[PDB]
Amino acid sequence: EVRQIAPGQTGKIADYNYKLPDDFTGCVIAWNSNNLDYNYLYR
Amino acid sequence: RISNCVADYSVLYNSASFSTFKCYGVSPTKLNDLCFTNVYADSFVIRGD
């Protein structure tokens, strides 16, 4: 959900849970974690 | 066309059920504020691409 969790944030992720303000930033890398380490929640 | 209503763009704006909610010209927030002369909406279905 890269486009989701990003600047230009809008959605329950933003208001409910998590959207840091718009400042010049980088991004996160790809991997497996549910089946490379589940029941984990937002806010 | 629609009229003779009262709107609440809120449940659509927040309930992300509307998936690819990408918009133009307006703030999808201020949508639950502004008022319009009249509205039109076309609907359809297409492939996943």
Swiss-Prot record, chain A:
Q: Give the start-end ranges of region Immunodominant HLA epitope recognized by the CD8+.
A: 38-43
- Give the quaternary structure: Binds to host ACE2. RBD also interacts with the N-linked glycan on 'Asn-90' of ACE2. Cleavage of S generates a polybasic C-terminal sequence on S1 that binds to host Neuropilin-1 (NRP1) and Neuropilin-2 (NRP2) receptors. Interacts with host integrin alpha-5/beta-1 (ITGA5:ITGB1) and with ACE2 in complex with integrin alpha-5/beta-1 (ITGA5:ITGB1). May interact via cytoplasmic c-terminus with M protein. May interact (via N-terminus) with host bilirubin and biliverdin, thereby preventing antibody binding to the SARS-CoV-2 spike NTD via an allosteric mechanism.
Task: Write out the function statement from the record.
Answer: Attaches the virion to the cell membrane by interacting with host receptor, initiating the infection. The major receptor is host ACE2. When S2/S2' has been cleaved, binding to the receptor triggers direct fusion at the cell membrane. When S2/S2' has not been cleaved, binding to the receptor results in internalization of the virus by endocytosis using host TFRC and GRM2 and leading to fusion of the virion membrane with the host endosomal membrane. Alternatively, may use NRP1/NRP2 and integrin as entry receptors.
This protein is called Spike protein S1
Q: Which organism is it from?
A: Severe acute respiratory syndrome coronavirus 2 (2019-nCoV)
Q: Which gene encodes it?
A: S
Region of the whole protein represented = 406 to 454 of 1273
UniProtKB/Swiss-Prot annotation, chain B:
Q: Name the segments for region: Integrin-binding motif.
A: 47-49
Q: What does this protein do?
A: Attaches the virion to the cell membrane by interacting with host receptor, initiating the infection. The major receptor is host ACE2. When S2/S2' has been cleaved, binding to the receptor triggers direct fusion at the cell membrane. When S2/S2' has not been cleaved, binding to the receptor results in internalization of the virus by endocytosis using host TFRC and GRM2 and leading to fusion of the virion membrane with the host endosomal membrane. Alternatively, may use NRP1/NRP2 and integrin as entry receptors.
Give the quaternary structure: Binds to host ACE2. RBD also interacts with the N-linked glycan on 'Asn-90' of ACE2. Cleavage of S generates a polybasic C-terminal sequence on S1 that binds to host Neuropilin-1 (NRP1) and Neuropilin-2 (NRP2) receptors. Interacts with host integrin alpha-5/beta-1 (ITGA5:ITGB1) and with ACE2 in complex with integrin alpha-5/beta-1 (ITGA5:ITGB1). May interact via cytoplasmic c-terminus with M protein. May interact (via N-terminus) with host bilirubin and biliverdin, thereby preventing antibody binding to the SARS-CoV-2 spike NTD via an allosteric mechanism.
Q: This chain belongs to which protein, by name?
A: Spike protein S1
Q: Specify the species.
A: Severe acute respiratory syndrome coronavirus 2 (2019-nCoV)
The gene name on file is: S
Whole protein: which stretch is covered? Answer: 357 to 405 of 1273
